[PDB]
Design a protein around this ligand. Structure first.
Ligand SMILES: Nc1ncnc2c1ncn2[C@@H]1O[C@H](COP(=O)(O)OP(=O)(O)OP(O)(O)=S)[C@@H](O)[C@H]1O
Ligand SMILES: Nc1ncnc2c1ncn2[C@@H]1O[C@H](COP(=O)(O)OP(=O)(O)OP(O)(O)=S)[C@@H](O)[C@H]1O
Ligand SMILES: Nc1ncnc2c1ncn2[C@@H]1O[C@H](COP(=O)(O)OP(=O)(O)OP(O)(O)=S)[C@@H](O)[C@H]1O
Ligand SMILES: Nc1ncnc2c1ncn2[C@@H]1O[C@H](COP(=O)(O)OP(=O)(O)O)[C@@H](O)[C@H]1O
Ligand SMILES: [Mg+2]
Ligand SMILES: [Mg+2]
Ligand SMILES: [Mg+2]
Lengths: 346, 285, 330, 328, 319, 239
DNA sequence: GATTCGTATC
């Protein structure tokens, strides 16, 4: 197993990076009966899902981690077959409605209204939680069913949905949930976690600075930092030195190369080459929102650009991110952003 | 109970409710209730109306313990009844009891097999084509089997539109024919003058008093509407025709007190009357 | 037992607070029998579902209710076909008879109510279908449409339905209800709290009740037996501390792009909500006496644009950085 | 049981003499009835202006008793696809008339909800069976009607109700319900109606419900605004004066205080300020462009929801900024 | 309640000599009537300019006493699926009917623009197999909706919009045959509001006669409304913003016109609008599209329309 | 032209009878230029010959192809110096082709074929900006009209003589969709392997971001020091 | 509609 999963804290006492959030979770889990609906929001990779699973273990005891996966079939208006995977353990349910596209409304209706009405009497009645990963990916139609589903059937079901940047979450849903903020760990805590991992894994470490380098390069991403740690562990024969290169994902390198090309050569042919690169990126299912975000924040790291160019770049990035939110085809807005940048740089 | 009626011959209710089947299969059926009996009136497109009556002597028990209103009117969905009364008979008394407890109460249909009582309650919903009896253009009395065969042939052919011929003669050579207009075109289906099939055919000249000979009566009917009477003719013994001047065709079916069926039909406007001349010339030829 | 929002939901029209206009009209309708077609609209958590459920109960009682009410919400299909068949069939239905107990104890008006909650999620085709169904059966059936955005209701339906706007529940409106809930659940609050709760929860009593419940759970888990302070309330309500906001303002004041970029990177690593920090920046800048009218006009438009862009489910980091950079050049 | 109905479908006109406002349409249709010739009508106008009432009253006047079997009425609540038009409408307008004689009527309420295929089929039914059947097409949006369908129909436009028609209907309702109404309340009701009678009847019903004793107490403009939840004209004038003249802090404070005094919405204030400013004589012309564009953007954003304080300060800033060109 | 045919159908021409407008096309149709060698033809144009009447008059003048079983008029109101086409059309074309020497059967297909494509392919087969005995006459509003394989076999006749002189002449004929009192300005107003439509002109004249009697400008304009596309064009071309706003308000908003109708008419007017630069025209189209989106999402107030006019004036006034 | 001349020289008597033989050549040239349909040309010629008046010669209108419409939008149309009327006729006659997302994709893919990409970057930015704005109108007719008009105006203001244009191509979007489908299949396989082998549930976004690169790297290092999925998800990236 | 290459003809 990966080091992200091998050393996942299985208890509320095993979480050792936020503490105050752990105290709040313990306050919530002291009396599970009056548990409200929760909304965990924070940067990607901080550990929100681990906190949800730790809270569930605190409430329902060990056994929430025995996940059974089954495929359940759906039917749309046009009568096509859709197969959603429902990672189901006892005492709780996991659903990723974003596995289907705009067709997640039928899931949020059928699958969730099925369990909301179905009680859990076995003379004693318990409430079974339901976890909704990536609550942002719901299409404002699943959320509209969600709000009344959880308002009226609160006696039998509890909703714990995880997300980052909960702005695309509608006001009725946000008003119906307890907002739990999960901040990202500081570099010291990431380095401490990596130190514990390497100690339990018998990796030879030259100096502790190469863990602070991993923490800084991951930008507060525990999973990303642990994956980097395992990568350089298995690419250096389990002996890491300060000469060991900081390794970054291929698409990040491609975006940085695209930034270099955009800054260097600014012509229509350069625009066409950038379009080819963007199409290659989209062929790897990298969402266009994060493509634009990484492109913007790599173009703002170039030192040859003055303040006027950077301000223009950030303004165009905001405009075209709003356009991308309301759009249907990503390539139009990505190409428009790149063209505007290449027209403003010169 | 405001109205209660029990019977053991559920075959009457089955055949009766099948007599409304040629009409809308998914719609509402209007039911009158009165001491004389209850009737199932159905209407389609404001152009045709069936009216099937079950008299009080049909039921072994018929109470109508109400006096505030002469009749009780309730409207229910037809296929709720059709889906529910699919009991496959039994063999068990299978006694059927019809109940109604005034406004705001469901129409109840109780079926008892001497142990099992599958009681079904039907939700009631929120709530014309009569010929003027003083004026009848023609009146014919035919046997049921001949008419059933005529409609069966007319359906075999398709018959996009149909015509009715009625011309009595001085020598009592009464002629009654069903002229169609289909893929083949004009097909003349004339019923015989024999008293075995046609027992009476009088064609009037208005006011339904003067028996005038040598003149013909033409009725241009849409065949989709004329087909609604076909299933009723299957159980009929004698079928009575009565067409007025306002273009209303009334069919008087009685399966001999048995059941009585009242089918009233509105007749097409006959945009072009050249076809009328064509039909009469086809007849005299 | 239950979350305080569902535990303290109003059961009768007397418990519904601060919406006196609609509630008096409905209470007067109780003794009459000419209830119109109602359009309930207002901000989230203002007491619309509570009002309709309380009225329906007061009308029919627990028994007749199951037979004289049809509720459709966004969790069930409400297409054009469904509106044309199921709603029309229920409107066509005759009024079920009351019992003796219902006739004596409850008013039992001679009609049925169709409640269409989350009506803003219905397409214009379904509402066009509903037009004549509402009209031609107005003597046997009453329609209630509940939504947050009236503009999603087509003009014909808005004309047919009587409009009942639900006001936002500020501190003054809902302070008594929050005090009632706090006292009955034995909540020890410092003075100033229960007003900060309603100021943070702008026009939302559900959010205020959940905030109070979470603060109570924390203060009970502590076991320390001390009151709840405003600082705790702001902490678990997602409000950015004043010191972080002051640092943001001071880094904006020295309009260096790289400093602002680095600070925004760390701040968005801290996991805050961009809408909340944008709101706090609005309060700080628009209420400050250190800025002139021109700066305030420009900052108001910039904040409006940023809020509108954030409402579209955009990237919080990019929007916040662009807003702060624009402020730095004002 | 007409006392068990909402005021809107309790004062629905039963005769053509009770349809106020549309003098010309009513006179022309009465002349059509008297002369015995009725063309294929098309009633078009805003909602709640008297289209369905007029057509039903006209059909009742033409067929006093045969109305059940002489008029086929269809609306958006009934399926009206290609098959319905082909079968039901054609078979109704293809058969001879009931009783002695006449022409059959086919009323199509809300015909803009019909598909183009249904209208294309309907056009030849209209042109072919016109000898004994006449059509009435009721529509709020004429762009959803095929140009051929508009061609083969006689167009009658229902204007929004003028002041006099609403005043007469209000007087009738007040006499019927033994209600009183102050002249200022009458003006407030006229302005909030915006040419709709359903709005007037709904507001009046809510005003009767608001009153403690509707047999003695009158209805003033205060009751009108309290029940309908709208800003008083004085409040709108005060907010606009604070925005235009006073500084930023006091303008924001005045806006918030006025809003919180009666729980007013910002969209109502926006519409009131726009109505007030439309009478303003601007001298820079760019003052109007900026006002209209900015306020339309703010209204759209409000319609999508969001931060109320941000939107209110945006309104104040948009107004003050635009009026900077006025002095230029 | 009584018996009186409307003037539109009471005065529908029965002979080709009574049809006004496209003189060359009607003369050609008369030639076809006299010689009798009618080709497959497609008739297209605006509504109400004498397309159906021309087809039916040609059929009557070509078939005479054999019209009863010589034409097969199928229309949109009738079912015209692939099976209907196959069965009915094939059986009609296979019907051997003796006609005059230079005569053929005629298959009138009115509203052929609303026919399914597979039915058009079946029509292709029938057209190319039974052409020696029967001929096809398509009546349509736009010839694009008829597939190219069918237009290949037809002689395309395009009916132009009726000129004011032809409609005036037909109006005068109907007037001097119905005995209505009129004024020259009244007939001018009827012509102006008809906008090249004969059916609309007849309907408006009959409405004015029924409602007020004498047909002058005042009665016509008090019963009929000036074409709102012209008002939309007037408001879009206004010099200053105040005049455009006033026109919009007092001529479209107070008159009871839907905002969606105003926006759609504005788009249609902008598409066909000279004396404006291409950049200005496309900018106006963009602003109209944005306002149309706002109307479609529910924000259909007068403020949105005023803002659209303000943006249009910004773009066209260099403001 | 040759075949219409043959039909005329076989109908000289009638053609000479109606004195139309002194005009037949110009009408034959006009018919030949108007259509590329032999049957329609002969039908129109027969209609003109058998007639006795000044009827205009009208032939069936032939549809405009995909690349034909793209070229008409980019480079304009000969004999029509009015962009407005050309775009109007393009929309009336070929609205089925113009009202699609594929047409905007084709414009985006082929606007760089004007003078082999040798034009100002400001014009390209304007074109792509207008296309992105049109993408925010959800298939309204105004969106397509505005986009095509803006593209045509932009290319008209920069068009001069001496231009050597390229060759247009169909958009590669379907290739990207097939690649995304292959990625979805590979990610589903990796997730399936990633549960029964070791209990772990990972979201698809993480698979696209990190687990599509780092997990295959780990498995390849494990492969070298030795799990079904050893190669990178979606294949390697290039440039 | 554009480019390129190849024909055919005048
Ligand atoms: N006026 C009020 N009086 C009392 N409780 C209220 C009031 N308004 C809201 N609440 C409380 O708010 C919670 C939910 O309010 P609801 O009225 O059911 O929801 P809502 O107003 O429909 O908001 P939506 O559905 O998201 S638009 C319940 O706990 C209610 O007790
Ligand atoms: N001219 C009028 N005179 C009197 N009451 C009117 C008039 N117009 C409307 N009303 C009132 O408005 C109510 C509903 O208006 P209707 O005319 O039935 O609806 P409508 O005019 O068809 O508008 P739409 O298009 O159907 S939303 C009626 O019951 C009357 O009370
Ligand atoms: N040129 C004309 N001369 C005389 N009457 C005409 C003329 N054009 C139309 N009409 C009148 O218009 C009515 C019939 O018009 P039609 O020819 O049926 O319309 P159309 O041209 O078929 O348009 P569409 O596409 O069928 S709506 C009759 O009342 C005719 O008198
Ligand atoms: N307190 C902690 N101690 C050790 N590891 C942690 C802690 N919190 C999170 N992690 C690690 O972070 C990894 C990814 O976190 P995850 O829960 O996936 O974040 P998210 O919920 O944002 O997806 C997990 O594999 C887990 O092992
Ligand atoms: Mg609700
Ligand atoms: Mg209506
Ligand atoms: Mg026609």
């Amino acid at each position: 197993s990966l080091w992200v999963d091998k050393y996942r804290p299985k208890s509320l006492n095993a979480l050792s990076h936020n503490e105050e959030l752990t105290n709040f979770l313990k306050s919530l889990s002291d009396q599970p009966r009056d548990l409200p609906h929760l909304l965990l929001y924070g940067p990607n990779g901080t550990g929100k899902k681990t906190r949800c699973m730790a809270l569930l273990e605190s409430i329902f005891g060990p056994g929430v981690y025995r996940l059974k996966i089954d495929v359940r079939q759906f039917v749309t208006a046009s009568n096509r077959k859709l197969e959603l995977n429902v990672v189901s353990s006892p005492y709780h349910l996991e659903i990723t409605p974003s596995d289907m596209g705009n067709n997640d409304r039928i899931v949020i209706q059928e699958l969730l209204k099925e369990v909301a009405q179905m009680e859990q009497v076995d003379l004693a009645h318990r409430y079974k939680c339901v976890i909704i990963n990536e609550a942002n990916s719901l299409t404002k139609d699943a959320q509209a069913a969600l709000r009344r589903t959880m308002e009226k059937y609160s006696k039998n079901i509890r909703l714990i949905m995880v997300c980052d940047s909960m702005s695309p979450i509608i006001a009725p849903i946000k008003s119906r949930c307890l907002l739990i903020r999960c901040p990202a760990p500081s570099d010291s805590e990431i380095s401490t976690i990596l130190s514990d991992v390497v100690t339990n894994e018998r990796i030879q470490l030259e100096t502790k600075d190469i863990l602070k380098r991993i923490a800084q390069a991951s930008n507060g991403n525990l999973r990303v930092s642990l994956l980097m740690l395992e990568s350089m562990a298995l690419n250096n024969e389990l002996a890491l030195k300060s000469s060991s290169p900081i390794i970054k994902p291929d698409w990040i390198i491609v975006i940085h190369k695209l930034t270099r090309k955009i800054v260097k050569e600014r012509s229509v042919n350069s625009l066409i080459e950038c379009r080819a690169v963007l199409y290659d990126l989209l062929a790897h299912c990298i969402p266009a929102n994060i493509i634009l975000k990484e492109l913007t924040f790599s173009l703002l790291d170039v030192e040859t650009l003055n303040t006027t160019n950077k301000s223009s770049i950030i303004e165009y990035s905001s405009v075209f991110d709003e356009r991308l939110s309301l759009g249907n085809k990503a390539i139009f807005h990505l190409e428009g952003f790149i063209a505007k940048v290449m027209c403003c740089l010169d | 109970n405001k109205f209660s009626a029990s019977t053991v011959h559920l075959e009457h209710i089955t055949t009766a409710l099948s007599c409304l089947t040629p009409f809308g299969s998914k719609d509402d059926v209007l039911i009158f209730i009165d001491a004389d009996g209850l009737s199932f009136v159905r209407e389609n497109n404001h152009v045709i109306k069936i009216q099937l009556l079950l008299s009080r002597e049909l039921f072994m028990s018929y109470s109508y313990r109400n006096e505030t209103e002469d009749h009780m009117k309730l409207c229910v969905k037809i296929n709720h009844i059709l889906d529910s009364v699919s009991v496959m008979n039994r063999n068990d008394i299978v006694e059927c009891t019809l109940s109604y407890d005034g406004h705001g109460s469901p129409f109840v249909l109780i079926f008892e097999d001497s142990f099992i009582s599958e009681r079904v309650e039907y939700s009631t919903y929120l709530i014309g084509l009569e010929l003027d009896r003083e004026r009848i253009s023609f009146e014919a009395i035919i046997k049921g089997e001949a008419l059933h065969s005529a409609l069966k042939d007319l359906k075999e052919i398709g018959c996009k539109e149909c015509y009715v011929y009625a011309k009595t003669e001085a020598n009592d050579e009464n002629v009654f024919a069903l002229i169609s207009k289909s893929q083949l075109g004009f097909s003349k289906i004339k019923l015989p003058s024999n008293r075995s099939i046609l027992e009476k055919l009088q064609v009037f000249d208005g006011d339904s008093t003067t028996v005038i000979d040598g003149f013909a009566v033409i009725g241009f009917f849409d065949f989709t509407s004329f087909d609604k009477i076909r299933k009723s003719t299957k159980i009929a013994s004698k079928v009575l025709f009565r067409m007025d001047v306002h273009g209303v065709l009334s069919v008087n079916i009685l399966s001999q007190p048995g059941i009585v069926i009242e089918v009233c039909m509105l007749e097409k406007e006959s945009i072009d009357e050249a076809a009328q001349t064509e039909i009469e010339l086809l007849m005299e030829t | 037992q239950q979350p305080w929002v569902e535990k303290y939901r109003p059961k009768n029209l007397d418990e519904v607070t601060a919406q006196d206009h609609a509630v008096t009209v409905l209470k007067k309708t109780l003794k009459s029998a000419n209830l119109p077609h109602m359009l309930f609209y207002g901000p989230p958590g203002t007491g619309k579902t509570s009002t309709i459920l309380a009225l329906t109960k007061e009308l029919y009682g627990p028994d007749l209710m199951k037979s004289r009410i049809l509720e459709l919400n966004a969790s069930d299909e409400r297409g054009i076909s469904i509106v044309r068949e199921k709603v029309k069939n229920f409107a066509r239905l005759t009024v079920s008879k009351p019992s003796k107990h219902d006739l004596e104890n409850y008013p039992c008006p001679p009609y049925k109510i169709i409640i269409l909650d989350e009506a803003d999620s219905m397409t214009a085709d379904a509402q066009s279908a509903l037009r004549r169904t509402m009209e031609t059966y107005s003597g046997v059936t009453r329609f209630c449409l509940i939504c947050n955005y009236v503009t999603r209701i087509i003009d014909p339906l808005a004309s047919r339905c009587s409009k009942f706007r639900f006001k936002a529940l500020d501190a003054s409106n809902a302070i008594d209800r929050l005090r009632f809930i706090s006292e009955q659940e034995n909540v020890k609050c410092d003075d100033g709290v229960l007003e900060r709760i309603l100021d943070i929860s702008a026009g939302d009593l559900r959010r205020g009740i959940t905030l109070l419940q979470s603060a109570s759970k924390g203060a009970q888990y502590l076991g320390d037996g001390k009151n709840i302070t405003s600082t705790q309330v702001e902490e678990l309500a997602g409000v950015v501390p004043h010191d972080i906001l002051i640092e943001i303002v001071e880094k904006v004041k020295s309009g260096d792009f790289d400093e602002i970029k680095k600070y925004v990177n760390t701040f968005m690593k801290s996991g805050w909500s961009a809408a909340s920090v944008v709101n706090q920046l609005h309060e700080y800048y628009i209420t400050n006496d250190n800025f002139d009218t021109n700066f305030k006009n420009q900052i108001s438009w910039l904040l409006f644009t940023t809020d509108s862009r954030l409402n579209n489910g955009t990237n919080e980091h990019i929007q916040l950085l662009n807003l702060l950079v624009k402020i730095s050049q004002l | 049981s007409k006392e068990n109905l909402p005021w809107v479908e309790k004062y629905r006109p039963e005769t053509l003499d009770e349809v106020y406002g549309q003098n010309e349409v009513i006179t022309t249709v009465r002349k059509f009835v008297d002369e015995g010739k009725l063309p294929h009508l098309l009633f078009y106008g805003p909602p709640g202006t008297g289209k369905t009432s007029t057509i039903v009253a006209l059909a009742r006047e033409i067929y006093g008793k045969n109305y059940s079997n002489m008029v086929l009425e269809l609306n958006a609540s009934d399926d009206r696809g290609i098959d319905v038009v082909r079968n039901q409408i054609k078979d109704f307008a293809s058969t001879r008339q009931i009783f002695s004689k006449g022409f059959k009527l086919i009323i199509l309420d809300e015909a803009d909800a019909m598909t183009n295929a249904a209208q294309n089929a309907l056009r030849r039914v209209i042109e072919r069976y016109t000898k004994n059947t006449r059509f009435c097409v009721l529509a709020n949006y004429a762009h959803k009607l095929t140009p051929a369908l508009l061609s083969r129909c006689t167009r009658f436009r229902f204007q929004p109700l003028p002041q006099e028609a609403i005043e007469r209907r209000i007087a009738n309702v007040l006499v019927h319900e033994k209600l009183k109404l102050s002249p200022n309340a009458e003006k407030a009701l006229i302005e909030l109606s915006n040419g709709d009678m359903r709005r007037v009847l709904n507001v009046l019903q809510s005003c009767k419900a608001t009153l403690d004793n509707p047999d003695e107490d009158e209805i003033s403009d205060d009751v009108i605004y309290e029940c309908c939840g709208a800003p008083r004209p004085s409040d709108l004038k005060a907010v606009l004066k604070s925005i235009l003249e006073d500084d930023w802090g006091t303008a924001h404070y005045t806006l918030n205080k006025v809003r919180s005094a009666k729980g007013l919405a910002l969209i109502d204030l926006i519409e009131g300020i726009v109505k007030i400013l439309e009478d303003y004589e601007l001298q820079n012309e760019e003052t109007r462009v900026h006002l209209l564009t900015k306020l339309a953007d703010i209204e759209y954003s409000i319609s999508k929801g969001g931060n109320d304080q941000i939107q209110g300060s945006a309104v104040i800033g948009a107004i003050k900024a635009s009026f900077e060109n006025e002095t230029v | 309640l009584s018996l009186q045919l409307p003037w539109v159908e009471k005065y529908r021409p029965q002979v080709l000599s009574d049809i006004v407008g496209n003189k060359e096309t009607i003369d050609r149709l008369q030639q076809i009537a006299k010689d009798g060698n009618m080709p497959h033809m497609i008739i297209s144009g605006m509504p109400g300019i004498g397309k159906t009447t021309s087809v039916h008059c040609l059929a009557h003048e070509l078939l005479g006493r054999s019209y009863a079983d010589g034409v097969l008029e199928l229309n949109a109101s009738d079912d015209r699926g692939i099976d209907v086409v196959r069965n009915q059309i094939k059986h009609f074309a296979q019907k051997k009917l003796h006609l005059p020497p230079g005569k053929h059967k005629i298959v009138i297909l009115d509203e052929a623009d609303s026919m399914t494509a597979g039915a058009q392919q079946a029509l292709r087969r029938t057209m190319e197999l039974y052409s020696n005995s029967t001929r096809f006459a398509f009546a349509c509003n736009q010839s694009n909706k008829i597939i190219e394989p069918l237009q290949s076999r037809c002689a395309i006749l395009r009916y132009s919009k009726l000129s004011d002189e032809d409609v005036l002449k037909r109006l005068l004929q109907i007037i001097k045959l119905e005995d209505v009192k009129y004024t020259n300005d009244g007939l001018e107003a009827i012509i102006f509001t008809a906008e090249g439509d004969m059916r609309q002109a007849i309907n408006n004249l009959q409405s004015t006669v029924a409602g007020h009697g004498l047909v002058n400008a005042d009665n016509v304009f008090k019963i009929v409304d000036s074409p709102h596309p012209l008002i939309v064009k007037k408001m879009l071309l206004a010099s200053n913003l105040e005049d455009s706003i006033q026109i919009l308000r007092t001529d479209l908003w107070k008159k009871g016109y839907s905002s969606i109708d105003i926006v759609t008419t504005s788009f249609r007017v902008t598409k066909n609008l000279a004396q404006v630069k291409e950049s200005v025209r496309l900018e106006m189209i963009k602003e109209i599209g944005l306002t149309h989106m706002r109307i479609l999402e529910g924000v259909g107030t007068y403020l949105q329309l005023a803002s659209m006019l303000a943006k249009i004036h910004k773009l066209n006034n260099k403001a | 032209k040759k075949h219409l001349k043959f039909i005329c020289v076989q109908n000289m008597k009638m053609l000479k009878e109606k004195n139309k033989w002194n005009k037949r050549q110009e009408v034959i040239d006009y018919i030949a230029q108007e259509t590329g349909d032999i049957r329609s040309a002969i039908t129109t010629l027969q209609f003109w010959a058998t007639s006795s008046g000044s009827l205009p010669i009208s032939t069936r209108e032939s549809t405009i192809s995909y690349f034909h419409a793209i070229g008409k939008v980019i480079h304009g149309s000969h004999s029509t110096n009015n962009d407005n009327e050309m775009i109007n006729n393009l929309f009336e006659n070929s609205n089925n082709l113009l009202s699609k997302e594929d047409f905007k994709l084709g414009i985006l893919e082929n606007y760089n074929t004007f003078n082999k990409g040798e034009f100002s970057i400001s014009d390209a930015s304007s074109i792509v900006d207008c296309l992105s704005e049109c993408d925010n109108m959800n298939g309204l007719p105004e969106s397509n009209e505005y986009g095509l008009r803006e593209v045509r105006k932009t290319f008209r203001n920069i068009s001069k003589q001496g231009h050597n244009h390229g060759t247009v191509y169909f958009p590669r979007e379907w290739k990207v969709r097939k690649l995304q489908n292959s990625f979805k299949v590979q990610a589903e396989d990796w997730l399936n392997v990633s549960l029964y082998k070791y209990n772990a549930v990972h979201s698809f976004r993480n698979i696209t971001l990190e687990f599509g690169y780092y997990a295959p790297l780990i498995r390849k290092c494990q492969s070298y020091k030795k799990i079904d999925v050893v190669d990178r998800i979606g294949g390697p990236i290039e440039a």
